Design an enzyme around this catalytic site. Structure first.
Site, mmCIF file in Angstrom:
data_model
loop_
_atom_site.group_PDB
_atom_site.id
_atom_site.type_symbol
_atom_site.label_atom_id
_atom_site.label_comp_id
_atom_site.label_asym_id
_atom_site.label_seq_id
_atom_site.Cartn_x
_atom_site.Cartn_y
_atom_site.Cartn_z
ATOM 1 N N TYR A 23 -10.966 13.070 -1.827
ATOM 2 C CA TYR A 23 -9.654 13.573 -1.381
ATOM 3 C C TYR A 23 -8.767 12.332 -1.052
ATOM 4 O O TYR A 23 -9.211 11.196 -0.939
ATOM 5 C CB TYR A 23 -9.754 14.398 -0.067
ATOM 6 C CG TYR A 23 -10.302 15.785 -0.178
ATOM 7 C CD1 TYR A 23 -10.473 16.578 1.001
ATOM 8 C CD2 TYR A 23 -10.696 16.322 -1.427
ATOM 9 C CE1 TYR A 23 -10.980 17.820 0.908
ATOM 10 C CE2 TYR A 23 -11.244 17.583 -1.532
ATOM 11 C CZ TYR A 23 -11.378 18.336 -0.324
ATOM 12 O OH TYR A 23 -11.856 19.623 -0.416
ATOM 13 N N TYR A 54 -8.587 14.703 -9.641
ATOM 14 C CA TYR A 54 -7.356 15.503 -9.711
ATOM 15 C C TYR A 54 -6.488 14.847 -10.863
ATOM 16 O O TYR A 54 -6.533 13.669 -11.142
ATOM 17 C CB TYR A 54 -6.565 15.542 -8.452
ATOM 18 C CG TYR A 54 -7.319 16.266 -7.297
ATOM 19 C CD1 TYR A 54 -7.742 17.620 -7.404
ATOM 20 C CD2 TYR A 54 -7.463 15.684 -6.078
ATOM 21 C CE1 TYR A 54 -8.268 18.349 -6.188
ATOM 22 C CE2 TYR A 54 -7.956 16.435 -4.882
ATOM 23 C CZ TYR A 54 -8.334 17.752 -4.986
ATOM 24 O OH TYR A 54 -8.703 18.477 -3.812
ATOM 25 N N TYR A 64 -5.304 23.783 -9.697
ATOM 26 C CA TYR A 64 -4.908 23.699 -8.316
ATOM 27 C C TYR A 64 -3.430 24.025 -8.205
ATOM 28 O O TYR A 64 -2.592 23.076 -8.473
ATOM 29 C CB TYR A 64 -5.093 22.320 -7.832
ATOM 30 C CG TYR A 64 -5.289 22.292 -6.351
ATOM 31 C CD1 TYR A 64 -6.383 21.704 -5.818
ATOM 32 C CD2 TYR A 64 -4.313 22.787 -5.497
ATOM 33 C CE1 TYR A 64 -6.496 21.590 -4.383
ATOM 34 C CE2 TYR A 64 -4.402 22.702 -4.031
ATOM 35 C CZ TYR A 64 -5.498 22.085 -3.517
ATOM 36 O OH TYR A 64 -5.660 21.919 -2.163
ATOM 37 N N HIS A 122 -8.517 24.512 -5.060
ATOM 38 C CA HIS A 122 -8.558 24.286 -3.598
ATOM 39 C C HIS A 122 -9.929 24.553 -3.060
ATOM 40 O O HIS A 122 -10.152 24.507 -1.823
ATOM 41 C CB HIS A 122 -7.656 25.337 -2.825
ATOM 42 C CG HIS A 122 -7.882 26.805 -3.287
ATOM 43 N ND1 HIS A 122 -7.550 27.231 -4.543
ATOM 44 C CD2 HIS A 122 -8.366 27.899 -2.633
ATOM 45 C CE1 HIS A 122 -7.805 28.502 -4.628
ATOM 46 N NE2 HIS A 122 -8.298 28.923 -3.486
ATOM 47 N N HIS A 176 -14.769 17.531 -1.007
ATOM 48 C CA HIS A 176 -14.605 15.997 -1.075
ATOM 49 C C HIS A 176 -15.891 15.164 -1.262
ATOM 50 O O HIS A 176 -16.846 15.422 -0.546
ATOM 51 C CB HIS A 176 -13.986 15.412 0.289
ATOM 52 C CG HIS A 176 -13.940 13.870 0.411
ATOM 53 N ND1 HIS A 176 -14.846 13.103 1.181
ATOM 54 C CD2 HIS A 176 -13.245 12.952 -0.312
ATOM 55 C CE1 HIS A 176 -14.717 11.824 0.893
ATOM 56 N NE2 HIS A 176 -13.763 11.706 -0.006
HETATM 57 N N1 LIG Z 1 -17.340 16.369 1.871
HETATM 58 C C1 LIG Z 1 -16.868 17.392 2.810
HETATM 59 N N2 LIG Z 1 -17.470 17.595 3.980
HETATM 60 C C2 LIG Z 1 -17.079 18.545 4.952
HETATM 61 N N3 LIG Z 1 -16.032 19.370 4.789
HETATM 62 C C3 LIG Z 1 -15.431 19.166 3.626
HETATM 63 C C4 LIG Z 1 -15.738 18.246 2.632
HETATM 64 N N4 LIG Z 1 -14.856 18.311 1.521
HETATM 65 C C5 LIG Z 1 -14.109 19.284 1.881
HETATM 66 N N5 LIG Z 1 -14.361 19.892 3.171
HETATM 67 C C6 LIG Z 1 -13.701 20.953 3.867
HETATM 68 O O1 LIG Z 1 -13.050 21.320 2.597
HETATM 69 C C7 LIG Z 1 -11.657 21.146 2.847
HETATM 70 C C8 LIG Z 1 -10.876 21.170 1.487
HETATM 71 S S1 LIG Z 1 -10.547 22.686 0.724
HETATM 72 C C9 LIG Z 1 -12.215 22.868 -0.258
HETATM 73 C C10 LIG Z 1 -12.712 24.211 0.181
HETATM 74 C C11 LIG Z 1 -13.280 24.469 1.515
HETATM 75 N N6 LIG Z 1 -14.632 23.804 2.053
HETATM 76 C C12 LIG Z 1 -13.394 26.031 1.725
HETATM 77 O O2 LIG Z 1 -14.385 26.512 2.276
HETATM 78 O O3 LIG Z 1 -12.382 26.761 1.282
HETATM 79 C C13 LIG Z 1 -11.380 20.330 4.080
HETATM 80 O O4 LIG Z 1 -10.619 21.136 5.006
HETATM 81 C C14 LIG Z 1 -12.851 20.004 4.643
HETATM 82 O O5 LIG Z 1 -12.889 20.718 5.824
#
Ligand SMILES: Nc1ncnc2c1ncn2[C@@H]1O[C@H](CSCC[C@H](N)C(=O)O)[C@@H](O)[C@H]1O
Length: 280
Positions: free
Chosen positions: A278, A248, A188, A236, A240
């Site tokens: 997260y 992490y 990351y 990234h 979550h």
């Molecule tokens: N359990 C979860 N449910 C819904 N959205 C999630 C999530 N964990 C992460 N996200 C989306 O993922 C984000 C972190 S960055 C992880 C990558 C992202 N889903 C992408 O398509 O690039 C957050 O902005 C959340 O919107």
């Protein structure tokens, strides 16, 4: 022996030192100066150096192991420094390596390679076919990478990006192979920005910010959250969950510098989606 620290034997020979803090150092001594095989450990039982000395300066081919599992090995220069033409950063699987030109433990030019065997102390590497040269390239507050589309060798073998299986999460990060717990899988890296900067702009923009330290935050903004724009590292992309299969953790990367990694909490399956809790 005792100074407020501690040392073991008469004139010289083979003794152990211990610091005001718990960490050992096993050296071989000649006239009270270190000359020969040494291995130093962490206040926690962790090998952080193996190799040798001569007139109290590190000499020969020496191994330096970071806490994350990565390592640096090579024949040191006249001052004990990791400077030379045949130095390698070796990844946590102890097999993928970036071999070549380093200044002070920093990588000027590293070539993809594999460490086939430690015969003695010395290690044998063999270059891997391909054009791929890697360089120390820390990102800044505005440049995420000098080669946004050169993937990380270690990551591209253990993970990949795809549609998330999680409800409405866009994309996700998948394991490629079966790995046991405590395994580094992905990096990351992003632009380095300050906490106040992240605290003061619209927060709708901190979807990919991840705090590095008390002073710095790694973010993967602008359009680099698309893999056709950036794929140097893939951290990234992990989504979550309240019951994650990953955590992490800190990482010392030869191209990226001080960053975080995604490390597994349990054995994980090929093709399993990788998650972290997260917000710590
Ligand atoms: N359990 C979860 N449910 C819904 N959205 C999630 C999530 N964990 C992460 N996200 C989306 O993922 C984000 C972190 S960055 C992880 C990558 C992202 N889903 C992408 O398509 O690039 C957050 O902005 C959340 O919107």
């Amino acid at each position: 022996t005792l100074e407020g620290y501690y040392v073991d034997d008469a004139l010289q020979g083979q003794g152990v030192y211990t610091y005001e803090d718990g960490g050992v150092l096993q050296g071989t001594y000649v006239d009270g100066e270190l000359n020969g095989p040494a291995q130093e450990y962490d206040t926690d039982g962790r090998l952080i150096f193996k190799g040798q000395y001569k007139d109290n300066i590190r000499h020969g081919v020496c191994w330096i192991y970071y806490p994350d599992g990565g390592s640096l090995v090579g024949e040191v220069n006249e001052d004990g420094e990791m400077t030379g033409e045949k130095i390698a950063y070796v990844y946590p699987d102890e097999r993928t390596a970036l071999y070549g030109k380093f200044i002070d433990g920093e990588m000027i030019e590293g070539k993809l390679a594999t460490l086939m065997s430690t015969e003695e102390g010395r290690p044998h590497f063999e270059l891997m076919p391909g054009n791929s040269v890697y360089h120390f390239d820390k990102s800044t507050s505005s440049c995420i990478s000098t080669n946004a589309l050169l993937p990380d060798p270690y990551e591209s073998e253990r993970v990949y990006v795809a549609e998330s299986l999680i409800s409405s999460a866009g994309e996700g990060l998948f394991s490629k192979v079966a790995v046991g717990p405590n395994t580094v899988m992905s990096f990351y890296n992003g632009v380095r920005i300050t906490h106040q900067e992240v605290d003061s702009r619209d927060w709708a923009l901190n979807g990919n910010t991840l705090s590095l330290d008390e002073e710095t935050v790694i973010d993967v903004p602008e359009p680099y959250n698309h893999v056709s724009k950036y794929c140097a590292s893939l951290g990234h992309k992990a989504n979550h969950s309240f019951t994650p299969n990953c955590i992490y953790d800190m990482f010392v990367h030869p191209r990226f510098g001080p960053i975080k990694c995604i490390r597994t909490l349990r054995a994980v399956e090929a093709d399993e989606e990788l998650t972290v809790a997260y917000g710590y």
